[PDB]
Amino acid sequence: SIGTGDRINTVRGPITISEAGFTLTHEHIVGSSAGFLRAWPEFFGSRAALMEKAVRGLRRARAAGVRTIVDVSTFDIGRDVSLLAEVSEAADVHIVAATGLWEDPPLSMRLRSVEELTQFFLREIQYGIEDTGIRAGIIKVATNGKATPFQELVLRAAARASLATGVPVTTHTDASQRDGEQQAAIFESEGLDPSRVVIGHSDGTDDLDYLTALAARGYLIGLDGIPHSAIGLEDNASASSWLGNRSWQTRALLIKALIDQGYVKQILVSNDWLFGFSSWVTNIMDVMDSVNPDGMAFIPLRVIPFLREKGVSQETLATITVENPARFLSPTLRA
Amino acid sequence: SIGTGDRINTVRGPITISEAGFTLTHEHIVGSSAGFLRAWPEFFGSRAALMEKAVRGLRRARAAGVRTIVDVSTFDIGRDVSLLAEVSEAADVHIVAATGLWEDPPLSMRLRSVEELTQFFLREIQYGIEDTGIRAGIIKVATNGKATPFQELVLRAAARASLATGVPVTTHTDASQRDGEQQAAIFESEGLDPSRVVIGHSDGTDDLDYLTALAARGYLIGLDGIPHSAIGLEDNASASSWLGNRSWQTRALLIKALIDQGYVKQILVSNDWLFGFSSWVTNIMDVMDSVNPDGMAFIPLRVIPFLREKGVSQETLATITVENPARFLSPTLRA
Ligand SMILES: CCOP(=O)(O)Cc1ccc(C)cc1
Ligand SMILES: CCOP(=O)(O)Cc1ccc(C)cc1
Ligand SMILES: [Zn+2]
Ligand SMILES: [Zn+2]
Ligand SMILES: [Zn+2]
Ligand SMILES: [Zn+2]
User: Fold this and answer.
1) Which of this chain's residues are annotated to bind Zn(2+) 2 (chains A, B)?
2) Which end of chain A is more exposed for a tag (fewer CB within 10 A), N or C?
């Protein structure tokens, strides 16, 4: 009970590699902000309504074959690990929680040094989140174009926490700006092995030069938003820029491109779904649920059959959906 | 137990006007960020260390004559009303908690409409903060120069919540940019009476044209940071720009200027002290405590005697420190 060791931390305790099964590596129960669900639960109808909706969605994902999700909600996404543990137990789906910082850190984080941030990320991996004793199994970081000075520190702190514990790093990018190239430079400057990093939102680009430049160095490629656009604060007239300019089939075909290039063991697929979403326009969930009623079951019910139709084998899809997440999540300095 | 009515809400329940006594109207137990004390209590040594330090400081303030403080920490300052109630009971000092939003709201707040924000502020005044049942007795808002679009909505929502409940509004300004002039315009556009508003950090300027333009319309003037600079994110080489360019005597003399102009009933004085401070550089509390060891007792131990030495009567100082805060805090549409 003291030490990361080799099992994977979930919000209901450690699991073996063989228990993870079919794993969605980039998901959210709720996309929110620190403190917001505790301060304003009625925003979501109620906490009970959100919890019940998440249990129904995870039971639908489980019926389609999902056994684990990685909830990549950080502190500043409003991660509530008590809600994750309740939903995990009710749905009988393992949930891996995250540490790290996304793109909305408050001043009490933004003023911290790289050493202080490393202490905070290590707290959440090695000791517990808040007073719950629940430990993170992944470290989430973010850029949106060139890193801000503080995001460079977050990247470096995530590398240090990974180098101490063997827990991997998952990134948010603006893939259209090729952020993974700067993220890789910063991680490598700290000595992190690329096999401990997934460069996320990588389905937000069709640039195979960018994607293969990352995979060739050993990074995992997170094709993690297949049923929806790589969304961002476009201001002006954003709202339901949800679906995106590109079809889900176009994003899914990147999975086949990377298989065809030899990178089957470096692909991680997901929906980047959520059951509540306060860090966006009001009623965004009506739009999301009308467009993708399968929610987190979209990957197994629609993307897997589509790839089979395109000639990808069941064995190759099991490597992507079962073997890769287990190898990636199992703590190590080199996977 | 349902309804604002006429008593003042504190973190230990309603008090009468006569129970408030000598009141500091702009203070903080902790200056932080939402969720931060729960997620990283070791930043402050521990939660117990911060709590004990706050109890010692409030007992020193009580020994100097203070009976109530108004903790103007919002959601995004990391207000923890359970910590306030614990400290209040241990120190035997009443604490009035705040709703509203300061200058660090997260995306889940910044994307909300004026109606949604009003619902949130009314929740915290009329129902309770989080699941505590503790109700706010004041609404805190902020600008730093020209209002952002979202800060205009916060100002308007604060006015609407005040117009429904009679709870007053307290503002953060960059006084050097005369923000209170735009804040007054926005409040008045919603129908709020100026007697329900204190324009804070007004000791951050020597501009008597600005200060009297506000007082002449009926606003209260918050001379609320006497022992320290009106601090802000100056970046570059901020850190210990704590003391400021102006002396505490220069700020205190604004109190006498406004008395001499006829505005004794519109002055509110405070320290704007805190016992922990994570929304600033590390170890800022060492600097603060070395420079002002009297903490929240600075007003009664140093500013009151200084004003007496300058010819202000004990009766005039009781109006400022006892009568004005009771009249201001007691819920009403017109004070
Ligand atoms: C909840 C975090 O979700 P995400 O996967 O980064 C998608 C996302 C949500 C909200 C904003 C402002 C940008 C992007
Ligand atoms: C805790 C809120 O305190 P304040 O009175 O506005 C003084 C203040 C603190 C922190 C920053 C970044 C600006 C100003
Ligand atoms: Zn993201
Ligand atoms: Zn996400
Ligand atoms: Zn302020
Ligand atoms: Zn303050």
Assistant:
1) 140, 172, 201
2) N
